[PDB]
Amino acid sequence: SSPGIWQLDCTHLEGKVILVAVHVASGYIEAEVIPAETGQETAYFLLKLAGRWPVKTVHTDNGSNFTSTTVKAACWWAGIKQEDGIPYNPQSQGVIESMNKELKKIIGQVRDQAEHLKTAVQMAVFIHNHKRKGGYSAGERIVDIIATDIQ
Amino acid sequence: SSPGIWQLDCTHLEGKVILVAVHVASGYIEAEVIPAETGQETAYFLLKLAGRWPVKTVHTDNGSNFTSTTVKAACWWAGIKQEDGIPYNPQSQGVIESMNKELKKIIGQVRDQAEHLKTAVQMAVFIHNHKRKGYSAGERIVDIIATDIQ
Ligand SMILES: O=C(O)c1cccc2c1OCO2
Ligand SMILES: O=C(O)c1cccc2c1OCO2
């Protein structure tokens, strides 16, 4: 449960890009729809995440965001250690692929309800983070993990 | 002051609107820049907030968002009790006014650094939530909700 570590994950749907940050120890996520994954979009997403949770380390999702000066500048600004996201544990690739599939399935389940993709993605964030698996939810786990770490 | 209670607050800068949700018991915030405060923007912001923290009650920032069918639909969807934001306790007006001024002060302190207002507002959320007063608001909200879960 290393309380400060997050992983970036970028997935595609409807010609659009969904950027996800996963808190690795809990499975809790935040996500956004963007028109394309650029360093600027990723840097802004990181700044938002790190203002909201104590982001110590981020495993970036690809080499272009690992390289990006703009991403490195947001990581410097927000006190984040930027790392690569090489699956030294190969069970990592499989966990992220399954989350993406789960997220896309929830997006499909909420399509009668959202006119824009960005709404369906935030409904999927909500359902993902509140899902009991404990059975604790990922929202409960990340709070428990970080609070234990503060104490 | 319950773990689940938040207050909406809408403030203006640079002819743009900044929408803030404050977790009342900790002072922790999330905020966004929007072109205008409409029911649709407010409903979307609430959906985002409630997928991220366990939002039980929202004190809406004005009667238009309290009334808005779109705001009520997002609160229904996310399981949030929508309430008014009448300051039955008058030290509320002043606590919110003071946060707006501190937020605008930080936005000013980061303007050499951000080309867009939205970046400066998220730098201000970051500095607000990490500021030690000695725990930070980010620490207090985590402690409050974890104590509640346990
Ligand atoms: O239910 C929770 O305690 C919770 C805690 C932290 C974050 C969250 C949560 O629900 C979804 O996003
Ligand atoms: O520093 C923290 O524990 C913290 C915890 C939860 C949320 C946050 C935080 O800092 C910024 O936003």
UniProtKB/Swiss-Prot annotation, chain B:
Disulfide bonds: none
Residues where Mg(2+) 3 binds: D9, D61, E97
Integrase catalytic domain location: 1-145
Subcellular location(s) per record: Virion; Host nucleus; Host cytoplasm
Oligomer status and interactors: Homotetramer; may further associate as a homohexadecamer. Part of the pre-integration complex (PIC) which is composed of viral genome, matrix protein, Vpr and integrase. Interacts with human SMARCB1/INI1 and human PSIP1/LEDGF isoform 1. Interacts with human KPNA3; this interaction might play a role in nuclear import of the pre-integration complex. Interacts with human NUP153; this interaction might play a role in nuclear import of the pre-integration complex.
Record remark: domains: The core domain contains the D-x(n)-D-x(35)-E motif, named for the phylogenetically conserved glutamic acid and aspartic acid residues and the invariant 35 amino acid spacing between the second and third acidic residues. Each acidic residue of the D,D(35)E motif is independently essential for the 3'-processing and strand transfer activities of purified integrase protein.
Function: Catalyzes viral DNA integration into the host chromosome, by performing a series of DNA cutting and joining reactions. This enzyme activity takes place after virion entry into a cell and reverse transcription of the RNA genome in dsDNA. The first step in the integration process is 3' processing. This step requires a complex comprising the viral genome, matrix protein, Vpr and integrase. This complex is called the pre-integration complex (PIC). The integrase protein removes 2 nucleotides from each 3' end of the viral DNA, leaving recessed CA OH's at the 3' ends.
Protein name stated in the entry: Integrase
Source lineage: Viruses, Riboviria, Pararnavirae, Artverviricota, Revtraviricetes
Full protein: residues contained: 1203 to 1356 of 1435
